[PDB]
Design a protein around this nucleic acid. Structure first.
Lengths: 91, 98
DNA sequence: AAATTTGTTTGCCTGAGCAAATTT
DNA sequence: AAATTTGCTCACCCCAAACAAATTT
């Protein structure tokens, strides 16, 4: 059903999958609890930078450095991918 | 007075370790693992949309939490996300969040 | 009734090329 | 020596702004 999942453990040491979206939700619930009405400036860039870094990181590992195959898997423009890599200084 | 809290530690998730001690670990790592599993469980065809896949999986909950936190308010929402109110409307429509 | 938000209009990623360089 | 990939140029979404209408303070 879901293709992006992570591994969880419960009290009874069973390992079970939960969707990544649930983890993201958890992280933000946390972030929000810790701040007390202190305003949030750029939450979108925050999350995005937090999520692109390991995305680029895993497809550059998977395509063994091949930016062309990487860009194809991701479904984005080769130039775009260059841009993103320069942005997080993985290059 | 102020201890450093780095970017990987701002958005975090509760993990359980080899000693049943609960610890906060980066959201980065959750994404990382979801992808490692998505790869290892891929026998073995091509992928053409990894980016939109991840992106939707991460936008949906970000949009959800922000709206809960602004009690439905789209102006405050778009303002704290740091995006134009119009595109916030666009994303919201795209995910059926109305 | 005044202030704010909504819903709606307006006007800063990509394919294709191409030579250099790298892998096959 | 061929094929592929890279680095680099070219020129089809996000944004502020505006405004009336709805809503919330």
């Amino acid at each position: 059903s879901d293709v992006l999942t992570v591994s969880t453990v419960n009290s009874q040491d069973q390992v079970t999958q939960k969707p990544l979206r649930d983890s993201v939700k958890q992280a933000l619930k946390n972030y929000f609890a810790q701040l007390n009405g202190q305003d949030v400036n750029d939450l979108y860039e925050l999350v995005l930078a937090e999520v692109e870094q390991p995305l680029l990181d895993m497809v550059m590992q998977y395509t063994r450095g091949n930016q062309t195959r990487a860009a194809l898997m991701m479904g984005i423009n080769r130039g775009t991918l260059r841009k993103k890599l320069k942005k997080y200084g993985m290059n």
